[PDB]
């Protein structure tokens, strides 16, 4: 994510890192001890999940590594339009919760009143490089009409937009599937946005998590 800074060490216990072949691919959100939520476009064979991480290259006492044994892509995911960009990853074993590994509650109300939010991840920063330390930025939700105005014909009810008109704080490559946290609830997942990254003119686009409460619950309790 661009134009943010390193997160506080204790403030992101729900953040997951998704790796393949030993390297960061995407973010994700621990939403249940057995399940990480992420973007469908992050699906690859052999996904590995790291929980409790802050600095990627440090072996951290708080971290836990888990292979993904099942990846459940939303049945209505449309890769071409990015619509319904959501996926559930089942961990091989329940995560051992701690101060630094905790699930984040889902926002169930699509009409929720909190419009200022945090984004988090290890995606590309403003220097064009990938950070070792997880980054954070505060951004604000954009109305659907404003976002539709920015990406005509591309925004659906399954998408939420957010950005920062002052500095352009925005998610970027490698942040996909990570959290948009508003009012201490998971409101969105990083999905897509402008190229280059930066939200001064066009907002970032996030999967609208509130639309998926039923499907998430049904998948977890199957």
Swiss-Prot record:
SMART domains: Tryp_SPc
Regulation of its function: Inhibited by a range of serine protease inhibitors including soybean trypsin inhibitor, benzamidine and serpins. Activated by a range of glycosaminoglycans including chondroitin sulfate, dermatan sulfate, heparan sulfate and heparin.
Domain Peptidase S1, chain residue ranges per copy: 1-221
Disulfide bond in keyword set: yes
Active site: 41 (charge relay system), 85 (charge relay system), 176 (charge relay system)
Chain positions of site Cleavage: 59-60
Positions of disulphide bridges: 7-136, 26-42, 110-210, 117-182, 147-161, 172-197
Tissue: In fluids, highest levels found in milk of lactating women followed by cerebrospinal fluid, nipple aspirate fluid and breast cyst fluid. Also found in serum, seminal plasma and some amniotic fluids and breast tumor cytosolic extracts. Not detected in urine. At the tissue level, highest concentrations found in glandular tissues such as salivary glands followed by lung, colon, fallopian tube, placenta, breast, pituitary and kidney. Not detected in skin, spleen, bone, thyroid, heart, ureter, liver, muscle, endometrium, testis, pancreas, seminal vesicle, ovary, adrenals and prostate.
Residues of this chain annotated as glycosylated in UniProt: 113
TM segment ranges: none
Induction pattern: By spinal cord injury. This effect is particularly prominent in macrophages, microglia and reactive astrocytes.
GO molecular function terms noted in the UniProt entry: serine-type endopeptidase activity
Pfam family, one: Trypsin
Any one GO biological process: positive regulation of G protein-coupled receptor signaling pathway
This protein's UniProt keywords: Autocatalytic cleavage, Cleavage on pair of basic residues, Cytoplasm, Disulfide bond, Endoplasmic reticulum, Glycoprotein, Hydrolase, Microsome, Mitochondrion, Nucleus, Protease, Secreted, Serine protease, Signal, Zymogen
UniProt similarity note: Belongs to the peptidase S1 family. Kallikrein subfamily.
Cross-referenced PANTHER family: KALLIKREIN-6, KALLIKREIN-RELATED
Purpose: Serine protease which exhibits a preference for Arg over Lys in the substrate P1 position and for Ser or Pro in the P2 position. Shows activity against amyloid precursor protein, myelin basic protein, gelatin, casein and extracellular matrix proteins such as fibronectin, laminin, vitronectin and collagen. Degrades alpha-synuclein and prevents its polymerization, indicating that it may be involved in the pathogenesis of Parkinson disease and other synucleinopathies. May be involved in regulation of axon outgrowth following spinal cord injury.
Protein name: Kallikrein-6
